[PDB]
From Swiss-Prot:
<protein>
    <recommendedName>
        <fullName>U4/U6 small nuclear ribonucleoprotein PRP3</fullName>
    </recommendedName>
</protein>
<comment type="function">
    <text>Participates in pre-mRNA splicing. Part of the U4/U5/U6 tri-snRNP complex, one of the building blocks of the spliceosome.</text>
</comment>
<comment type="subunit">
    <text>Component of the U4/U6-U5 tri-snRNP complex composed of the U4, U6 and U5 snRNAs and at least PRP3, PRP4, PRP6, PRP8, PRP18, PRP31, PRP38, SNU13, SNU23, SNU66, SNU114, SPP381, SMB1, SMD1, SMD2, SMD3, SMX2, SMX3, LSM2, LSM3, LSM4, LSM5, LSM6, LSM7, LSM8, BRR2 and DIB1.</text>
</comment>
């Protein structure tokens, strides 16, 4: 019997190709010393964000993700072949789970692209988190 000190919030997004959005997610997780991860299915696919830490930091991060980042914002994308105008009008972010953990298996905060949905689920599985993803 021990206290439960870790808050946790989980978000799912449709597209995370905007490098400016990735930069904000990464830098705020780093500056807030949040733990968790951000996974998506292929470069241009849907994915999940999990953050774990204290209450204050998780609430700041929710406001960042749900209110301050413009997920629907068009941008120009630089690829191996050229530069293209991306249409993001259909992009969106949802908060799914929120709650408390007694312990977390996360080591820092990390971003990864997975090759398929099953790869993503397998990865969440290593952190006991596979249930957090809605296919």
């Amino acid at each position: 019997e021990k206290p439960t000190v870790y808050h946790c919030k989980v978000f799912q997004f449709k597209n995370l190709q905007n490098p400016k959005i990735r930069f904000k997610l990464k830098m705020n997780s780093k500056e807030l010393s949040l733990k968790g991860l951000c996974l998506r299915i292929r470069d241009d696919g849907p994915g999940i964000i999990i953050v774990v830490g204290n209450e204050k930091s998780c609430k700041f991060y929710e406001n960042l993700v749900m209110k301050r980042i413009k997920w629907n914002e068009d941008f120009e994308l630089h690829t191996n072949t050229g530069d293209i105008k991306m249409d993001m009008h259909n992009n969106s972010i949802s908060k799914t789970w929120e709650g408390y953990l007694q312990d977390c298996k996360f080591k820092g905060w990390f971003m990864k692209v997975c090759n398929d949905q099953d790869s993503l689920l397998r990865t969440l599985g290593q952190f006991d988190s596979e249930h957090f993803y809605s296919p």
